Amino acid sequence: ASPQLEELITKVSKAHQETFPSLCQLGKYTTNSSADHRVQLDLGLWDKFSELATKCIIKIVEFAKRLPGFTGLSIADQITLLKAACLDILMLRICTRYTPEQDTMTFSDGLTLNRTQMHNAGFGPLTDLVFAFAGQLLPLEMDDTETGLLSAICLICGDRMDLEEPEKVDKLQEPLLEALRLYARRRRPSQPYMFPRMLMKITDLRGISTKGAERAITLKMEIPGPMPPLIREMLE
Numbered sequence: 001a002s003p004q005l006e007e008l009i010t011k012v013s014k015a016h017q018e019t020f021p022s023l024c025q026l027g028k029y030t031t032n033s034s035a036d037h038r039v040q041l042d043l044g045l046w047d048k049f050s051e052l053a054t055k056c057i058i059k060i061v062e063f064a065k066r067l068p069g070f071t072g073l074s075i076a077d078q079i080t081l082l083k084a085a086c087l088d089i090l091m092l093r094i095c096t097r098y099t100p101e102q103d104t105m106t107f108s109d110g111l112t113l114n115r116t117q118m119h120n121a122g123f124g125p126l127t128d129l130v131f132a133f134a135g136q137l138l139p140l141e142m143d144d145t146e147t148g149l150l151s152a153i154c155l156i157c158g159d160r161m162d163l164e165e166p167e168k169v170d171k172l173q174e175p176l177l178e179a180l181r182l183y184a185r186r187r188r189p190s191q192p193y194m195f196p197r198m199l200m201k202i203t204d205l206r207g208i209s210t211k212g213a214e215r216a217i218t219l220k221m222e223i224p225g226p227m228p229p230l231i232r233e234m235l236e
């Protein structure tokens, strides 16, 4: 149907893959830090978790700038969209790295934490709800292209508060929505509820990112200094 749409799919897929390695491509390793009992916070796991979060924020920015038209938005709007969506995309990303058989999540350096360690690294009381979100992503069996498109749709959203040109953002989102439906239906024609199910996960993701911002407030009181500067940028 449209060469332009096919190219958009290819571009978004490549941008995702090049900013987010697949679980299969990573050499996993583990830590024995606070591995068998939940505690309020393990500072060694927090330091590594938060370092890895900073690095992924920079990768999400890199991803965003590869999305067609994103750099043609005002710099203010680019920053507003990134602030509004980066926690959503972080959470989607980590949940895509869930290995159910071991109940672990894997970071982009290969660090593989069990559920107790994810709790102890900072998720705290939000841990099991995030793992349940990850578990309910599994039946969708999304591929990397679908994850990348969904991430783009989450980011390029015209409803965000304080956008200067929300209509322009909406027009950038339209082909991404078209692209995801076309791709998802082509890939699995006998599962036509996959596209609407994927879109409704954006709503679920917003709920868990809202809870994540609430957790950031209590976590701040548990750690001995401020959070890393790019995390604070995301949270404001």
Ligand SMILES: CCCCCCCCCCCCO[C@H]1O[C@H](CO)[C@@H](O[C@H]2O[C@H](CO)[C@@H](O)[C@H](O)[C@H]2O)[C@H](O)[C@H]1O
Pocket (backbone or CB within 6 Å): 055, 057, 058, 059, 061, 062, 079, 082, 083, 084, 086, 230, 233, 234, 235
């Ligand atoms: C969500 C809240 C964030 C809102 C937006 C604010 C974040 C702004 C990010 C702009 C980052 C500028 O990026 C600039 O320095 C980064 C860190 O040294 C470099 O980042 C480079 O190194 C990283 C390793 O540290 C790699 O993972 C990046 O892929 C690589 O490009 C950039 O190549 C350079 O262009």
Ligand SMILES: CC1(C)CCC(C)(C)c2cc(C(=O)c3ccc4cc(C(=O)O)ccc4c3)ccc21
Pocket (backbone or CB within 6 Å): 049, 050, 052, 053, 056, 090, 091, 093, 094, 106, 107, 108, 109, 122, 123, 126, 211, 212, 213, 215, 216, 219, 227, 231, 235
């Ligand atoms: C705001 C703050 C600090 C506190 C509150 C909670 C615990 C909800 C939180 C969670 C995350 C988070 O889900 C995350 C972290 C690292 C990640 C690293 C990678 C990666 O290596 O590819 C991918 C996804 C990631 C996703 C980030 C920050 C925060």
